[PDB]
Design a protein around this ligand. Sequence first.
Ligand SMILES: CC(C)S(=O)(=O)NC[C@H](C)c1ccc(-c2ccc(C#N)cc2)cc1
Ligand SMILES: N[C@@H](CCC(=O)O)C(=O)O
Ligand SMILES: N[C@@H](CCC(=O)O)C(=O)O
Ligand SMILES: [Zn+2]
Ligand SMILES: [Zn+2]
Lengths: 257, 258
Amino acid sequence: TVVVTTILESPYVMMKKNHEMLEGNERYEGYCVDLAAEIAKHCGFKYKLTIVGDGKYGARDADTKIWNGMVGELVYGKADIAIAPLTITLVREEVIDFSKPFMSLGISIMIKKGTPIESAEDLSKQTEIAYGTLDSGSTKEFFRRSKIAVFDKMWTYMRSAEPSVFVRTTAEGVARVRKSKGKYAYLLESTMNEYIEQRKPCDTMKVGGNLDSKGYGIATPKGSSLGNAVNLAVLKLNEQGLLDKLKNKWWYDKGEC
Amino acid sequence: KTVVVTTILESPYVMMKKNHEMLEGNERYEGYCVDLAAEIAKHCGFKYKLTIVGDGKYGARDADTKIWNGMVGELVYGKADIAIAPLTITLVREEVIDFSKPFMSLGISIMIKKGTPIESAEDLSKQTEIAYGTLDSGSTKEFFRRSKIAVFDKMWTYMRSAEPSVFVRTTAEGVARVRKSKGKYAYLLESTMNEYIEQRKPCDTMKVGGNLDSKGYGIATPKGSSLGNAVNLAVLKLNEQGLLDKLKNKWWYDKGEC
Ligand SMILES: CC(C)S(=O)(=O)NC[C@H](C)c1ccc(-c2ccc(C#N)cc2)cc1
Ligand SMILES: N[C@@H](CCC(=O)O)C(=O)O
Ligand SMILES: N[C@@H](CCC(=O)O)C(=O)O
Ligand SMILES: [Zn+2]
Ligand SMILES: [Zn+2]
């Protein structure tokens, strides 16, 4: 039985309304739940969905060099595969393997409706509206590493701002937008932003273009014998239009705005 | 040793320089893929030679003969070391060659002559006055050939039987066909090529509708090659540093003529 690490992050993996009367894999639903079932069916394996213990995507401690999150679960042998909205990144591909991407995304801006911001450049030129990102993920690293002037400027602000502009979970960022009266903007992946914009209470918006262009991949420990098959499965699912079918199902068929 | 790169004359990816006959070797060519090859070779630490695929094709396996043609075949049969081109990542190809993570996103799209009364694939499928087709030997043809989606299956049943042939040998031929056909030919081609031509004179075509699928171009190497790991890491670094976005803008939008 293959141990799958994943993360609670809507609409990728959510607890079912009736989860308390369900067991095992049946507790959960979402895009990644459906994708896991399809990958396991094409690859011929049984599997156990497990939520990452620390609730993180994965970053490396600069001092100890120890990885956390789903990345660490793979690196240290705690899970066999990560099926999640896990961004393919150079630093991570150095320590784990990724399938070809199953979904495209870019960094984007979430505002409370009516907030006078149209772009990253607008954020970087003003100070009334605070802005930040998730911890231990690929968007914080994007700002930490960018040499593009606007983005460097934003990072200098964010890394020193008080109180802290960073959040532990996507849900914490979204809530901070919603409650901040237009004075907090949240930087997060377009996929999450576009799902949130179609949910009640319908008070947030994506603005501006995306800041980058990248993909999520299925991750395995380096050199795993599962990596080949998983990759071919992703290519097959994409070619059959199954990935587009799931995207519709969990985004746009699930729209309430 | 010097790495032999296979590529294809396809604008704006690889083009002959106006003055190519006065230049030699790699200097004869320009375009997005030319720029990208230089950067992959620098980051991976190799010398290279650009060569244009002899048959002018992307790559497909003959159904009876089982021989791969195009760039894919040059890799499969040992004629080239790497392909740096707008080569779509597909399952059938991944079974015989290796691909990096994609360097560019694309989907199949519709090119019309401006004013043509079509907005969508469904529109094309429900009418007969306007013919439509694809490049005769690439991933777009295969997408229709294999599709189980009703609109697309309907389109393939039309295309495969239409006379005269709605298929073309090169992108350029399809684009010329749209331009000459007074709105009676639509061309099914990748969004990247469509969006490039939309910004070129005579400014008489446009992309219409959403894309039909969502995929990527990858750098390809023969299966199990030693260069594959390094090339993938290069692609990742270049995407993270914004080089690939810069190149896109350089060859599509910075010198757009429309
Ligand atoms: C054949 C498909 C399985 S795929 O490899 O093209 N992936 C599909 C998916 C929708 C996707 C995600 C991400 C990107 C993408 C990533 C990075 C870059 C760059 N540079 C360009 C495109 C392209 C496609
Ligand atoms: N997808 C991201 C997490 C979300 C983000 O950083 O915005 C990762 O894999 O780190
Ligand atoms: N990029 C395609 C060729 C163009 C097309 O089929 O539209 C391939 O790799 O086959
Ligand atoms: Zn399936
Ligand atoms: Zn520490």
